[PDB]
Amino acid sequence: HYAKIRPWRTFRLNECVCTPYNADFDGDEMNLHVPQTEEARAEAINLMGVKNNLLTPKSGEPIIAATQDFITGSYLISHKDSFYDRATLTQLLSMMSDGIEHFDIPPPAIMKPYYLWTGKQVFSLLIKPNHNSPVVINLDAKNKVFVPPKSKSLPNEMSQNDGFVIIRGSQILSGVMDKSVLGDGKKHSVFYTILRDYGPQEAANAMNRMAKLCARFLGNRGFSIGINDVTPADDLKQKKEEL
Amino acid sequence: TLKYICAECSSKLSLSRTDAVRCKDCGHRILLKARTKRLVQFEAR
Amino acid sequence: EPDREKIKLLTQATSEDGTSASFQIVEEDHTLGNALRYVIMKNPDVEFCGYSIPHPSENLLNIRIQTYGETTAVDALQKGLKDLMDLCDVVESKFTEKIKSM
Amino acid sequence: VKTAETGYMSRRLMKSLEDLSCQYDNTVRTSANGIVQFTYGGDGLDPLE
Amino acid sequence: MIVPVRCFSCGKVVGDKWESYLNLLQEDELDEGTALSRLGLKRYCCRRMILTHVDLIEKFLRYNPLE
Amino acid sequence: EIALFKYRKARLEPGTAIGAIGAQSIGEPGSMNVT
Amino acid sequence: EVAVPDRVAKVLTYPEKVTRYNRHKLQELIVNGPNVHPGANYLLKRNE
Amino acid sequence: AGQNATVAVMSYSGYDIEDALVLNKSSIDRGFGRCETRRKTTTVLKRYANHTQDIIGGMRVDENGDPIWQHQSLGPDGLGEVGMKVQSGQIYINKSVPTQYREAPVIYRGPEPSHIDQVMMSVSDNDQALIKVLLRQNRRPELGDKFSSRHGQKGVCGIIVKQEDMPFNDQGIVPDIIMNPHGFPSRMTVGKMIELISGKAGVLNGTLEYGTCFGGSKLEDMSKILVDQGFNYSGKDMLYSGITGECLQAYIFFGPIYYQKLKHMVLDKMHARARGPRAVLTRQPTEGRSRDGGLRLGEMERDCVIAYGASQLLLERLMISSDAFEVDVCDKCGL
Amino acid sequence: SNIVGIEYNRVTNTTSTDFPGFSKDAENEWNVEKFKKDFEVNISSLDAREANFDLINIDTSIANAFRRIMISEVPSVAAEYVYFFNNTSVIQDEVLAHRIGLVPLKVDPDMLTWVDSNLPDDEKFTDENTIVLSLNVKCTRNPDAPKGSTDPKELYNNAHVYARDLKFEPQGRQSTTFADCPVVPADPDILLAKLRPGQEISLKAHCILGIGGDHAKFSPVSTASYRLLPQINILQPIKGESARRFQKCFPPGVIGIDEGSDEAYVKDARKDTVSREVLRYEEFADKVKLGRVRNHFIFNVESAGAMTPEEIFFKSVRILKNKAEYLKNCPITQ
Ligand SMILES: [Zn+2]
Ligand SMILES: [Zn+2]
Ligand SMILES: [Zn+2]
Ligand SMILES: [Zn+2]
């Protein structure tokens, strides 16, 4: 890594990096080694660097990708019924950019009653923020829960539950953003395609934008678990003691 | 000054070089050193 | 006696028209950033406004303003700072005129 | 019992497979330059890529 | 060991309502939940300050040097 | 152009510790009366 | 990146050998000394 | 052993991702989770067969009647004063062994200061002196202390938040802890979802409830007390957002959970070594944590950096900065 | 629509939607003389310790800002340094010093100046920036005790030390300036500690002023919070015994019934804690639509003692004004 010097008494890695260490934040510790020579400092950052080791050598699959709570906040944006106006959108685009990166606002998805942007137009600005950004990706992927279409002639993205993601020209035309396209197993991940076409920094930059947005979004949107999530309805309770 | 609170008799007794650790009037052999007379600063945080 | 280190201009983020700008305002928080971002986004010419506190262990804040090509983004900051003072002059007024009428 | 046998397995596969490398000849050789593979995998390609 | 001065989640001062909480229960006895409301603890963060307060200063003060 | 450039990238680079890499790819991850 | 505690950063050093290019930088780390973080714990001369 | 925290089960700040928990700053300022450490230190002033005895020294003044730095917390009889602050280098028992006296005092070597609370002067069975000094230290929740509920969900403190940034209800209650909703589905602790309602309905009723095994209070009449007030039956409240002011778009499962603070604290775990003592046989850095230190790089990470091919790191991390040794070989003998 | 939509599983329509460029009709510009026509304050109740008032027709960016000033940035006086002389009680000294800095004080904070940090420790605490409070108690065994002898108030003379045992030593000109308003602890029966014979506490405490974002002891309110008002829209009116159980789904004063079984009408929709207990019954769903008005805020500001809770609000609007004023008169370092 690169050191960053901060006032507490603990090591703070990013949460997308705790998957190769196979660690969680429950009291365990890690070991930091500072190399001491210029040759040993340069072999460590170039061969053992994070951006170069974003794929496991076992199968060439992404291993540093979105963790458990950055898949939820990402699904809850690109869910089909999230609609944002200019005041919410540009604040949401400033969460991921730190108020530094420049954005080119596309025309909204909905125009005549109000001006609304879907949540899929927000992640298309996380991939390439403006026209100066080079990242132009074209992938095509199934989500985890894929309900197929009604007829078998409608191709794949006419699916029920919106479970087939098609990105054309670094912009998301269908499908939610989940573990299938942001997590650590698939060679059709969004982060995998940015790495294999544009290099380790552009895939790292897009991941740092998604880590910052989903760490500011989800505490201002609200997501929670209660006893009514686990409670069965009373027509399950009758049908359980029949089967 | 006078120091060395006894353990359970709670009497007070200074000690010389080589007298004892006996609490005279009690005979008990644990002596707690009393609190200092110096000022101790604390912040209220 | 000006304060040279309160507000900056992050020159690595701006354009050359001045229509886009980032500002690193220190010793501020969500209480002053969100009030500005409401007021600045109520201009007809502001096309982007959003603050962000980039790390919580830094008493610091970056506001971002992008306008259309009719107003420098410093001028939209300086407008939106004035309208926030005008807001609190109304709120101080009607609060005192209902306390002393009680 | 899973934590022991996970470390124990690649620690003994290591001791046979430490000093095998891809040479500039494109063969995979040992310490003593004896050929294990004339080309890696039969196509020369890299699993990470 | 002794009552907190303030509620943790509000900062409402609850340290002056322990001496009076025990008098509402001991004499003129109440059912521990209208003795809270009579002291004026509406929020549940403030009721749990003195309801689940175990007072250990009374037992610790039994073991001092008699002095 | 894309597919050929991906094919030269995919070749095993010389000097790599391909046996050490293969020994960690195997030992690391987790009909009738058969083992 | 990794966030290192600034109490560990005071004790874990790096042997920065001075050149033309970091002569002015390392002089500021000498005068700050060991007890403020843009600083330095030791100095090893060319010959001593 | 624990305190009732007001717990909003929600995802917040992105610093509570995998078992970290979000903490309130104004709760810690009022005494939420604040603990205290006490440590004993025994010296025995042993008398010897030479009829000479260990002695406690004296206050060492300089230039007038004030002590030097190491004797600031000492007092006149060489045993430190009760109530005084000892910090990282001072002396609180000034003992001397033998008539010459070789000064061998005890030195408080801790990373943080600590107040003397109890100095006990007694004599053991074999008629020799026994000083026990107890040292007190107050400490509050830092980033990195372990809290837990009573449901096996250990967690660490990930961030401390300013209390105008916490979410708040209509009455104005803010959480002491925010807990991630992602620790529930994989771990299936449904009995923590009933501890919160029984905790919430009980404190609104004024009665402690029961969560005893195969029994306890029932969810269908803890949810009767909870509608009786005007709260929701399910314990989910509509919280506002402390940062932006708005209603959160979900109802927040919100109430009191009993949290307990564990002994694994990051002040007693953060350590770091540049150079220090070496073991006299192997002349490598020493063992253990309570030494200066030395972190072992052993037999399994060596494997990892061979696989990267990083050969000068492996040369540096194993030889150059562990045990390097300039040796003189002979060329014709090899010895 | 400014009504937040409350449903059974989610909350809808929670954002500001009052900027130009929300729609084609680019309306809702700034227009401060139109905000002045719309804005309105109603005062529900006003106590010496608790204000209750509305702030109608504002944005929740501004209303939360006033809440965040009152909690975190409005200053107040609290004890900061404690100097112990002979604490031989069971409560440790750093614990008792935390209990003493956490009691409220009746100092008016406009009578003191801010202390410094980058000045030496000798001329640090002047009589315009500090206040010295001393506690000095001694527990003795009362000889005249009744022979039942269990309650420690008639067992010992000073068995409990309260906050009204914190006397006030006026330093310098504070014997004339604070001659009218002596420093009393604003909640004087705060149990600080309790004692047994032989045990003794003596101390002095120096009381500077700070803000709530530093420590929580400097926060002036016991809670300054708001809420939006709930509106209860009874679509398709409800009568009979169904109106009797539609009444019970709310808090009791909220909803009335006019003449038995004519209809159920909403009486005081200010009064309900929103618990949406109506939405778990499928009979009333399609015959009620309960919501929440996003313009209409209801502040409840209750003080800790030091200053009246409408002066906490007047200072907090004045602080948020002086933040925008300071930043406008600062040069932008290009
Ligand atoms: Zn005795
Ligand atoms: Zn408290
Ligand atoms: Zn409270
Ligand atoms: Zn030889």
Side-chain angles (χ1 to χ4, degrees), chain H residues 329-335:
Chain H
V329 303
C330 182
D331 200 4
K332 68 183 293 295
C333 299
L335 271 70

Side-chain angles (χ1 to χ4, degrees), chain A residues 42-199:
Chain A
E43 290 184 353
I45 199 61
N46 292 314
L47 298 174
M48 303 180 63
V50 171
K51 292 186 262 76
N52 300 114
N53 296 318
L54 292 176
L55 273 69
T56 184
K58 177 186 288 180
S59 183
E61 285 179 351
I63 193 166
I64 297 168
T67 186
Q68 71 197 14
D69 202 3
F70 295 164
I71 289 170
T72 293
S74 175
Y75 169 77
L76 288 170
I77 296 169
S78 66
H79 194 266
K80 181 68 80 66
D81 57 357
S82 305
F83 297 99
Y84 302 103
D85 51 356
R86 281 284 266 264
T88 311
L89 180 268
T90 62
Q91 175 66 42
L92 192 63
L93 303 177
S94 299
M95 291 172 179
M96 65 186 187
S97 69
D98 291 335
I100 304 168
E101 180 73 25
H102 180 268
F103 291 98
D104 290 333
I105 305 301
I110 294 170
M111 290 185 177
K112 173 64 177 61
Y114 311 115
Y115 288 155
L116 293 176
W117 282 260
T118 64
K120 296 182 179 66
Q121 292 177 351
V122 177
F123 278 92
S124 65
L125 289 170
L126 190 147
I127 303 171
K128 66 182 298 295
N130 49 7
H131 66 282
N132 295 317
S133 181
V135 178
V136 177
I137 63 170
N138 295 309
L139 66 99
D140 211 2
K142 285 186 181 176
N143 286 320
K144 278 177 89 282
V145 180
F146 174 74
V147 182
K150 290 184 283 188
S151 180
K152 290 185 261 74
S153 68
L154 306 180
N156 224 5
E157 72 267 13
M158 296 297 290
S159 73
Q160 294 171 348
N161 86 358
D162 188 67
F164 184 76
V165 39
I166 165 170
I167 300 170
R168 292 287 184 265
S170 174
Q171 64 189 357
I172 302 172
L173 292 321
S174 296
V176 302
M177 291 290 105
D178 60 348
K179 185 180 175 66
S180 176
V181 294
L182 304 173
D184 57 351
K186 297 295 185 290
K187 292 180 183 290
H188 56 263
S189 180
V190 177
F191 290 151
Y192 185 76
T193 306
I194 298 170
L195 194 154
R196 298 298 293 163
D197 298 333
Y198 297 101

Side-chain angles (χ1 to χ4, degrees), chain C residues 3-4 7-9 11 29-31 34 38 41-43 78 83 87-89 92 94-95 98, chain I residues 18-20 28-30 36 39 41 59 61 68-69 310 313 318 321 326 328 331-334:
Chain C
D3 197 1
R4 299 291 305 276
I7 181 170
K8 282 175 64 178
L9 177 70
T11 61
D29 204 2
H30 302 285
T31 171
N34 205 167
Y38 170 69
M41 202 67 207
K42 293 180 73 65
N43 296 126
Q78 295 296 115
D83 296 330
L87 201 164
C88 298
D89 288 330
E92 285 177 355
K94 287 188 179 183
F95 186 77
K98 297 295 286 184
Chain I
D18 57 353
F19 61 94
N28 291 314
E29 295 88 2
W30 173 247
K36 186 172 174 63
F39 179 67
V41 170
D59 195 72
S61 306
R68 290 171 62 94
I69 308 297
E310 75 271 15
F313 186 75
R318 186 68 181 270
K321 178 187 177 296
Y326 187 84
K328 187 170 69 68
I332 293 172
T333 302
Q334 294 185 358

Side-chain angles (χ1 to χ4, degrees), chain E residues 6-14 41-49, chain H residues 6 30 171-174, chain I residues 222-223 302:
Chain E
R6 293 180 181 262
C7 173
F8 291 159
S9 294
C10 286
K12 184 180 184 295
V13 175
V14 303
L41 295 175
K42 283 94 169 65
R43 298 189 293 271
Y44 70 87
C45 61
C46 299
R47 297 171 73 95
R48 73 181 177 85
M49 281 287 110
Chain H
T6 304
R30 299 180 189 106
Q171 290 172 349
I173 308 168
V174 295
Chain I
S222 291
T223 293
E302 58 190 4

Side-chain angles (χ1 to χ4, degrees), chain A residues 201-227:
Chain A
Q201 182 70 52
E202 293 292 328
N205 285 326
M207 194 181 294
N208 297 136
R209 286 194 291 270
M210 187 196 67
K212 289 180 172 67
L213 171 136
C214 296
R216 282 170 176 84
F217 172 75
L218 201 57
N220 294 317
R221 193 263 178 200
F223 178 72
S224 187
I225 185 168
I227 201 62

Side-chain angles (χ1 to χ4, degrees), chain H residues 29 136 165 230 236 245 251, chain I residues 7 68 94 98 226 273 276:
Chain H
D29 296 335
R136 184 184 75 236
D165 288 328
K236 293 174 81 73
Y251 303 106
Chain I
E7 285 89 7
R68 290 171 62 94
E94 63 266 19
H98 179 258
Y226 62 84
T273 63
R276 63 270 169 204

